Amino acid sequence: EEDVVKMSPLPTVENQFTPTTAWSTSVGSGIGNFYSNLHPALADNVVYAADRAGLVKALNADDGKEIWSVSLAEKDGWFSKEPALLSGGVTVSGGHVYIGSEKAQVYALNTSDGTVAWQTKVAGEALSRPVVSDGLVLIHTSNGQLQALNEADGAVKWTVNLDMPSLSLRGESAPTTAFGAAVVGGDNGRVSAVLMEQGQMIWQQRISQATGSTEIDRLSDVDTTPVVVNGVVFALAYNGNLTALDLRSGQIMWKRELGSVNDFIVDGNRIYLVDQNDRVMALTIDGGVTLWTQSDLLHRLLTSPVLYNGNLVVGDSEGYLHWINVEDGRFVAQQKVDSSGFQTEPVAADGKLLIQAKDGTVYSITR
Amino acid sequence: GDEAYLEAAPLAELHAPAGMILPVTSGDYAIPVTNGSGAVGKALDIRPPAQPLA
Amino acid sequence: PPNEIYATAQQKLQDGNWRQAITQLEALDNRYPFGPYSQQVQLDLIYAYYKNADLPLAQAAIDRFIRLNPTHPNIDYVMYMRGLTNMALDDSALQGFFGVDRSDRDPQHARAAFSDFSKLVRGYPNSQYTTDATKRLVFLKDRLAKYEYSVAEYYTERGAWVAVVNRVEGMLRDYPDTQATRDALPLMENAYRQMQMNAQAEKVAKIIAANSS
Amino acid sequence: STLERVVYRPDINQGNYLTANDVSKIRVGMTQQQVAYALGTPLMSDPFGTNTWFYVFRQQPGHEGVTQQTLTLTFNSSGVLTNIDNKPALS
Amino acid sequence: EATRNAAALFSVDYKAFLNEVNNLNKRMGDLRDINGEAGAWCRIMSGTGSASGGFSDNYTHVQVGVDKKHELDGLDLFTGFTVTHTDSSASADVFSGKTKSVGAGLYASAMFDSGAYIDLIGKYVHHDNEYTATFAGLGTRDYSTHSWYAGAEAGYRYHVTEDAWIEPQAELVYGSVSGKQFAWMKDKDYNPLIGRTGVDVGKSFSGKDWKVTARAGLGYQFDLLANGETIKGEKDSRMLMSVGLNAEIRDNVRFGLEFEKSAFGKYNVDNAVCANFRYSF
Amino acid sequence: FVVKDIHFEGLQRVAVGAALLSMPVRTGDTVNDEDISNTIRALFATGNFEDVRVLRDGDTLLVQVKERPTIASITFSGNKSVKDDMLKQNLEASGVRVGESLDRTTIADIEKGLEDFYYSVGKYSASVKAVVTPLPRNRVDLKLVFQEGVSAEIQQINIVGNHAFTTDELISHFQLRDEVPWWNVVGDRKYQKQKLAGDLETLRSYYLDRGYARFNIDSTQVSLTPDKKGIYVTVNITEGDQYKLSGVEVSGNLAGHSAEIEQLTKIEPGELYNGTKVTKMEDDIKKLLGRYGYAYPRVQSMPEINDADKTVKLRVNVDAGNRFYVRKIRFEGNDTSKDAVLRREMRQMEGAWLGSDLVDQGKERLNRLGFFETVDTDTQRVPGSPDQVDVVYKVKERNTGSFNFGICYGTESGVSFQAGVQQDNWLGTGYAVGINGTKNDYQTYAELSVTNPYFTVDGVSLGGRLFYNDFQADDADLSDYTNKSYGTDVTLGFPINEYNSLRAGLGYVHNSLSNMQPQVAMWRYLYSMGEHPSTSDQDNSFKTDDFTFNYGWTYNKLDRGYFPTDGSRVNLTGKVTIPGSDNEYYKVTLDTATYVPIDDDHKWVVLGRTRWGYGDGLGGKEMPFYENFYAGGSSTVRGFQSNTIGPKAVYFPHQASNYDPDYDYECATQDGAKDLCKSDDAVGGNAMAVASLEFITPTPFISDKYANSVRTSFFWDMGTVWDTNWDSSQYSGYPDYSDPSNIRMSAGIALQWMSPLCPLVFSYAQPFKKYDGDKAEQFQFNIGK
């Protein structure tokens, strides 16, 4: 039966461009109905992709070249292989390709050959996006711990525990750095920003509304990528809002309403948010002026947004797209490119829009 | 109802001879005499005794 | 109004039948727990459930009445009906239709009709149902003593001369004035003769001939 | 008869267990709290006037004879003087 | 007379169409005020009677299924699978054999105490006809046929009194039977439209747990789509007077006078008046 | 400065002393002008008084508090797979009740027993809202609209740190499963919070049996997906090393048991630290001390984890108390059964020392009677004496009885008496009286079986049976004749062991075979003893007077007598006529019912049945055919007709009949040929060998039983019946009936639901290996037993 409301119908497409360039290669075995963070990446026009079965490949932005298929998740060398739940996230930086997993293995592939993968045993399940900063691969696991690994062999293994709430939602908060302080989103509605030397003072701040409510299920949660401008950590959370704190370890705090679990883009004075009701809004850096909403996409399982050539393209749950403008947000453009659906976030660099579906089908749509 | 509680045998306490004081009669299940004189059998006030007003 | 239902709640089993006295009686207890007729309808569910074979749910209606007000003036009616709903679980079944002796059945219902009748004849001696409670305690003290005779009747043919002399000694302390004690008294003498305790068999032999039935 | 020694008869144990080691540890001039601590509480007693405890150890296997060891202890009014009467076998 | 005697083997789907359908008292009994969310019921039906020329009829109709109590606004929805393992021992004197009628289906009854009698019953029965003839060199015979049923039940009940109720019930079913051939002369596919109407004087007195339901009935059977190619067919009306009874106690879920008679026609359906009894103590 | 009019006519709605006379404003005035501050904002602000209306001066003063009406009934509309009973019992303790006054306050407490109850089962998107209906003030009820949430779904199960065993082996022993194949039904995504701690202790005990004594589990993360459609759960374990068991050490007071305890705790050299073996030796010492008088001992275990050489020893501190004696053995629950029935099945005697092996022997003895459903022993304790116990049995009676009176009179058939009185207890005295008065139109079958199980006190039984067949079949010729049989029976049984039982007795059997058809298997008996009539005429009468000696032997070791799941039951019924009767023969019949489980919860039970029979003549007799063996039908070989497995006799050439209207089945006439003419019906053989094998399945889609009623199983059964005296030299074209190799196999699925009012068993089977002439049907149904 229906819980609250069904999916919203699709409005009239406008289609003011020619998005005819799209090549489809179904790599891997497909993710399916599993919630993961398997997003593609690019480095010098080399598109990388993976899957939960361990089929890690490499392609090109034009048509697809330098194709090597390795069995990273095998774990068996007797008669067959077995998947090891490769759902960490492909990040290519510094000549190495770091993919996390859900079986305490943080692989590190190469660029040319891509078969030498030293693995480091961690104290949980790697689910966050592995970022690098000055030769340190940060991993936010599912047990609420922070293990930053080296780029050579992972010798430094400092570990700090933030919080562990009962019946949490996720632990895949991608950390960002800001002048040496790696801002790490917690798991119980706390925003932490410690230096990456050995683990400094946490100065935790409760920003979620789980303490106000008596009965909570998954209210205390924060899963964001806090990109900063001028030393301002936004760091929104579930059932909260943006929490635009300073880098100088302050205690002042203000949110408004209605925060989500997805990501957002900072264009300086203008930001663009998503909610659980899936209405793409827009705000400013100081409070908010002309908070416009879009009720045409009510409960359509919306993914994370991304800017591409001035337009904000957002995927859907069946394969449709939403090319939305910036001045008021009325124009839409729905393209039936996939039949399975989009769950991971789309990445876009240097005129190349990359989006991976649930079956492992990358796209290079350009408009 | 039944007609077994009025047609039952009466109770008669046995006696103790010389040499046996019989001190065993020290337990429960005793029937006192509280001047029982009223209605027995089927002709009883089976209706609930509702309380009148003042 | 609650008075429009209680005015039509007089059709009892003597006026209507065994089914109409409950349908307008249950609707005044749940919808008005603290109404005008609070303790009046509680004394009506007890009597209506007694003759309609509604035995187990009427026992829960008994203990509710003492629990919420123990200062009731004529409280002897609810204590007398507690002994009657325990004697309704006695030999009034298809076995009682044939006319058999059910004294060797489960005495849990007959022993439960003794702790309430003992408080009625000792707490309120000048009550109304004091005469019928004493006449009902003679049949209950004879049915419980006849259950101990059937235990010693089985233990004297299988053969257990410690189990026989423990039930008759327990019958001489609990039920000293009944017919089952004088009938199990040769059973206590026979168990002393099967063992080598001839000094104890002459004590029972001097009490059977001293009390000739 | 024919079915005298064919029908199975279970073990019929009666009274309390009387191990022959802790029987001869009691003597005269002993209170009731020490006899009930060593041999245990008696299963049967004499309530008719006096206070005599009967420690009967009776066991009967299936159609193989009856064995009974009776130990009767006659206490006094205070409960200190005991009359030791041990019957190791029945007639 | 060789074609009329061989037409008795082809006239086995017209008699089985009446045996496959039934009333509410033959599959659910009296489904009045039971708080059971899911319960398996026991029901065994057996009829007899020589139709024309001494027909040995010893069919045993059995059915078992569960229910699903789903009350929303007084319009309940029932869902449960039923089986139809009918052993039809119907044969004449000239040819011998039986008929293994195996089937399965489901039912959806939305009956209520207000009188909203709307039931949708659909079942699929695969018939197996095994006969052994002696005249005209036929001998043994074996084929296979299918049958789809769509039972659309209607009716309303008005409460004129406190105990005696009247239920004028109407039935409208649809069949998808087929034919067969010989090998040593065949039929076609037909869709029957057998319907019936009549009132049901139900004297239901469910005061105590002793529930007596003196149910009557003056139903009449007629054919809407009458075929004339089985030679040709014939016309025959039926009479379906039935007086039911039940006594559903916690120890007696039996003692029901279930019978039905007829007055005109060339067929016999059941006995005059006979019942059952059981008791568990 | 007093206020007179303060009691107006709007405060006597719900109370007069608690609402109107709650604060004594009249004749209790103390303050000068603080009357408004002492009653309104001090007392009239908490209970039911929401109005904070400021009172005016002494001319137009009015309070005018409107009391909100009471709640009449809570109608839970739209019961979406939920029960109204468990939804209203939590609302009485936390929430609102019926008839209780609600002064417009309860908005959150109704969401405590309803919305938080949905959070426990998995519905996290619940949006319930209780809105009161428009109705006048008398008995205002409300409607309950239900907005359900998400189902309890589980996406995946993952176990990290399992360096020894794979992650797929652990799900096969987990109670909380993820996905089911077509092999089973249960095991899909059902997330329960109480079931999460169930399989976590199974994972805690899975590594303890293999030797990992240092096995520890970290915190379990139960993560939820955004836009919830599943529930993830991840455990973190930290196993140690596989240790070895060095030796045991039993300390404390053994009370003379120093030889049967140290031999019981003996281990094997080179054995690991098994977790299930420590708790088995913890109970087996407690079971050993209970067989001597010690009812309440005290035993512990101190495992010494030695991480140096990877070894571990255990120290057991046995504290045996004193000898406990039984004071009284009381029984409660026997409403319809007398105390003498429940006392004969007691192996523990009153007034002796408490032997725990004898109490469990008396508990299983009451289970194999078939009179009770649930039995248990509650060993009490006397508060006065420190070594006296009261063994109490709490039994529950079962409806041991069946009164089938399904008689009915047809329009032309006639009176059809079907009296089926059969019970194991007459009035609770142990007497088993079964009266089957099956009086048909001609078949006037009436029997009376009274059996006393305890004629003496040891257990000797004495029974009887008086049958009367009176079977007149004067219409058909399907191996039928005019039969008239009667006779009595006397059976005296006695036990020879705790599980075995023997029996013996006499018996008189009378028969009268009149007007029977001639064939081969029926006239080989008449050619041996008696006369030699002509083979071309009917109505050849024969009257036999038998004097049999019925022996037998019965072994019973079942766990239950009602419908068991464990144990075996072997039966044997034999008889032989004494010298001097009309016929000299014997017959041996054997039965087997073996129940064996293949798991721990007794869900998959393998049942194996075996029926063997044999019978021959003594001194030249030829096995009288009214007491032959018949196979087929139901409960013996499911998948065939009633008594169709066996030899089929060749009919002799007939010459006449009753009327012969040119369709009778008698041969050698104008309707057939003129030679020896075979038949198609079964006549039975002298021997019989039927073996069956079933597999009791788990609970089907019909899951309502309320104790144990429904039972579905699939089977595979064989069987054959051959005539051991059939001459094969005089018959060539006919099949050999002397061959014990014509096995008839069948397979199918059965369904047995043991309801007290419809105790029928129906089964669908398909014979895959049959022979010629055997009439086989698919669906079968009867009562059973």
Residue whose C-alpha is closest to residue C132's, from B48, B11, B13, B2: B2
Treating both helix axes as pointing N-terminal to C-terminal, what angle do C164-174 and C179-194 enclose, rounded to 10 degrees?
150
Cα E207 to chain centroid distance, Å, stands at: 30
Write the DSSP assignment of F542-558 as a string of letters. EEEEEEEEEEEEEEE--
Paired tokens of A20: 């005819």
User: Residue with structure tokens 């059952």?
Assistant: E276
DSSP assignment letter at E24: G
User: Residue with structure tokens 């063994």?
Assistant: F391
Q: Which chain E residues are Cβ-neighbours of C18 within 8 angstroms?
A: 208
> What domains are defined for chain D?
13-91 (3.30.1450.10)
Q: Where are the alpha helices (H) located in F691-771, listed in sequence order?
A: none
d(CA C116, CA F240): 64
Residue whose C-alpha is closest to residue F719's, from F771, F764, F761, F760: F771
* A38, A55 contact by CB (below 8 A): no
* E132, E94 contact by CB (below 8 A): no
User: Residue with structure tokens 């919203």?
Assistant: A8
d(CA D67, CA D87): 11
Residue whose C-alpha is closest to residue F452's, from F502, F422, F497, F493: F493
User: Residue with structure tokens 């026991």?
Assistant: E42
Beta bridge partners of F143: F75, F131
Tell me how close the Cα of F510 comes to any Cα of chain E, in angstroms.
Answer: 33
Helices then strands, each counted (H, E), chain E: 2, 20
* A237, A224 contact by CB (below 8 A): yes
Q: Which of F359, F458, F556 has the highest number of chain D CBs within 10 A, making it the mutation to test binding with D?
A: F458
Paired tokens of E208: 């105590």
A1 interfaces chain F, CB cutoff of 8 Å = yes
d(CA A200, CA A242): 24
d(CA A327, CA A311): 10
Instruction: Compute how many other C-beta atoms are within 10 angstroms of the C-beta atom of residue A71.
Output: 13
d(CA F392, CA F346): 12
- Return the HEC string of F254-286: CCCCCCCCCCCCCCCCCEECCHHHHHHHHHHHH
Q: Are F334 and C105 an interchain contact pair (Cβ–Cβ within 8 Å)?
A: yes
Q: Which chain C residues are Cβ-neighbours of B50 within 8 angstroms?
A: 40, 43
d(CA F312, CA F249): 12
Tell me how close the Cα of E127 comes to any Cα of chain F, in angstroms.
Answer: 13
Sign, CA dihedral F160-F164-F170-F172, equals positive
The domain of E120 spans 1-281
Paired tokens of E201: 């004087």
Q: Are B19 and D47 an interchain contact pair (Cβ–Cβ within 8 Å)?
A: no
Q: Which chain C residues are Cβ-neighbours of D71 within 8 angstroms?
A: none
- Phi/psi of residue A323, nearest 5 degrees: -80, 105
Write the single-letter amino acid at F104. R
d(CA A146, CA A126): 10
d(CA E51, CA E269): 8
* Strand, coil or helix: F312: strand
Residue whose C-alpha is closest to residue E85's, from E102, E99, E100, E98: E102
Name the residue facing E280 among F399, F703, F760 (closest C-beta). Answer: F399
Strands, sheet with F154-160, edge to edge from the N-terminal-most edge strand: F154-160, F231-238, F216-217
Helices then strands, each counted (H, E), chain A: 0, 26
Residue whose C-alpha is closest to residue E101's, from E8, E13, E23: E13
Q: Which of F101, F327, F338, F347 has the highest number of chain C CBs within 10 A, making it the mutation to test binding with C?
A: F338
d(CA A82, CA A23): 30
Paired tokens of A75: 């774990």
Half-sphere exposure of C83 (CA within 13 A, CB side): 24
Q: Do chains D and A touch (3 or more CB pairs under 8 A)?
A: no
* Strand, coil or helix: A235: coil
Contact map slice: D 61-90 vs C, CB within 8 A: 68, 70, 72, 87, 90
Residue whose C-alpha is closest to residue F406's, from F433, F434, F432, F436: F436
From residue E235, give the alpha-carbon distance in Å to each of C120, C210, E3, E228. Answer: 82, 99, 18, 9
* A96-99 vs A91-93, strand pairing mode: antiparallel
d(CA E61, CA E47): 9
Treating both helix axes as pointing N-terminal to C-terminal, what angle do C130-158 and C164-174 enclose, rounded to 10 degrees?
170
Paired tokens of C64: 């509710």
Name the residue facing F495 among D8, D12, D15 (closest C-beta). Answer: D8
Q: Which residue of C has its CA nearest to B25?
A: C173
Burial class (CB in 10 A: 0-12, 13-18, 19+), F56: exposed
User: Under 8 Å CB-to-CB from F256, ≥6 apart: which residues?
Assistant: none
User: Left (φ > 0), alpha (ψ -120 to 50) or beta: where does E95 sit?
Assistant: beta
User: Residue with structure tokens 């139960």?
Assistant: F222
Residue whose C-alpha is closest to residue E32's, from E258, E277, E206: E206
User: Under 8 Å CB-to-CB from F277, ≥6 apart: which residues?
Assistant: none
Q: Are C169 and D47 an interchain contact pair (Cβ–Cβ within 8 Å)?
A: yes
- What's the CA angle centered on E138, arms E132 and E143, to 5 degrees? 65
* C18, C51 contact by CB (below 8 A): yes
Cα F51 to chain centroid distance, Å, stands at: 63
Q: Which chain B residues are Cβ-neighbours of C139 within 8 angstroms?
A: 4-5, 8
DSSP assignment letter at F353: B
* C102, C94 contact by CB (below 8 A): no
Instruction: Compute how many other C-beta atoms are within 10 angstroms of the C-beta atom of residue F576.
Output: 16
Quote the radius of gyration of chain E (alpha carbons, Å): 20
d(CA F601, CA A54): 40
C57 interfaces chain E, CB cutoff of 8 Å = no
* Strand, coil or helix: F361: helix
* F405, E279 contact by CB (below 8 A): yes
Q: Which residue of B has its CA nearest to D45?
A: B24
Cα F255 to chain centroid distance, Å, stands at: 42
User: Residue with structure tokens 């949980």?
Assistant: A124
* F714, F750 contact by CB (below 8 A): yes
The domain of F544 spans 402-782
Write the DSSP assignment of F99-111 as a string of letters. T-B--S--SSSTT
Tell me how close the Cα of F349 comes to any Cα of chain D, in angstroms.
Answer: 7
Element (H, E) at F762: strand F761-769
d(CA F394, CA F454): 23
* Strand, coil or helix: A271: strand
Chains that touch A (3 or more CB pairs under 8 A): F
Instruction: Compute how many other C-beta atoms are within 10 angstroms of the C-beta atom of residue A60.
Output: 14
Burial class (CB in 10 A: 0-12, 13-18, 19+), A90: buried
From residue C94, give the alpha-carbon distance in Å to each of C50, C97, C98, F428, F432. Answer: 19, 5, 7, 11, 17
Contact map slice: D 26-65 vs C, CB within 8 A: 43-44, 46-48, 54, 56, 58, 60
Q: Which chain F residues are Cβ-neighbours of E66 within 8 angstroms?
A: 702, 704
d(CA F556, CA F595): 12
Residue whose C-alpha is closest to residue F405's, from C131, C1, A159, E278: E278
* Strand, coil or helix: C184: helix
Tell me how close the Cα of C168 comes to any Cα of chain F, in angstroms.
Answer: 13
d(CA A348, CA F132): 53
Q: Which of A4, A161, A167 has the highest number of chain F CBs within 10 A, making it the mutation to test binding with F?
A: A167
* F140-145 vs F71-76, strand pairing mode: parallel
Q: Which chain F residues are Cβ-neighbours of C89 within 8 angstroms?
A: 335
Identify how the structure was determined: cryo-EM
* E60, E86 contact by CB (below 8 A): yes
Tell me how close the Cα of C22 comes to any Cα of chain E, in angstroms.
Answer: 12
Tell me how close the Cα of D81 comes to any Cα of chain F, in angstroms.
Answer: 23
Chains that touch D (3 or more CB pairs under 8 A): B, C, F
* F453, F432 contact by CB (below 8 A): yes
Write the single-letter amino acid at E123. K
* Strand, coil or helix: F88: helix
Paired tokens of F339: 């105390």
From residue C35, give the alpha-carbon distance in Å to each of C30, C39, E111. Answer: 10, 9, 39
d(CA A197, CA A195): 6
Write the DSSP assignment of E115-158 as a string of letters. S---EEEEEEEEEEEEEE--GGG--EEE--EEEEEEEEEEE--B
Residue whose C-alpha is closest to residue F401's, from E246, E278, C53: E278
* C32, C41 contact by CB (below 8 A): no
The domain of A36 spans 1-367
d(CA F629, CA F631): 7
Q: Which of B13, B21, B31 has the highest number of chain C CBs within 10 A, making it the mutation to test binding with C?
A: B31
User: Under 8 Å CB-to-CB from C8, ≥6 apart: which residues?
Assistant: C24
Q: Which chain F residues are Cβ-neighbours of A169 within 8 angstroms?
A: 223-226
The structural domain count of chain E equals 1
Q: Are D49 and B24 an interchain contact pair (Cβ–Cβ within 8 Å)?
A: no
Instruction: Compute how many other C-beta atoms are within 10 angstroms of the C-beta atom of residue A175.
Output: 25
* F325-332 vs F377-379, strand pairing mode: unpaired
User: Under 8 Å CB-to-CB from A78, ≥6 apart: which residues?
Assistant: none
Q: Do chains F and E touch (3 or more CB pairs under 8 A)?
A: yes
D47 interfaces chain B, CB cutoff of 8 Å = yes
User: Residue with structure tokens 């069949």?
Assistant: E175
d(CA F253, CA F376): 31
Tell me how close the Cα of E213 comes to any Cα of chain C, in angstroms.
Answer: 18
Element (H, E) at C190: helix C179-194
Torsion of CA F733, F734, F739, F742, to 10 degrees: 110
Resolution (A): 3.4
Paired tokens of F304: 């010494």
Residue whose C-alpha is closest to residue A297's, from A323, A264, A267: A323
F760: domain CATH number?
A: 2.40.160.50
d(CA A71, CA A73): 6
Q: Are A124 and F80 an interchain contact pair (Cβ–Cβ within 8 Å)?
A: no
* E195, E172 contact by CB (below 8 A): yes
Q: Which residue of F has its CA nearest to C167?
A: F328
d(CA C65, CA C72): 9
Tell me how close the Cα of B24 comes to any Cα of chain C, in angstroms.
Answer: 5
Q: Are D49 and B19 an interchain contact pair (Cβ–Cβ within 8 Å)?
A: yes
Q: Do chains C and A touch (3 or more CB pairs under 8 A)?
A: no
Write the single-letter amino acid at C204. V
Cα F210 to chain centroid distance, Å, stands at: 35
Q: Are A1 and F124 an interchain contact pair (Cβ–Cβ within 8 Å)?
A: no
Residue whose C-alpha is closest to residue F688's, from F583, F587, F773, F545: F587
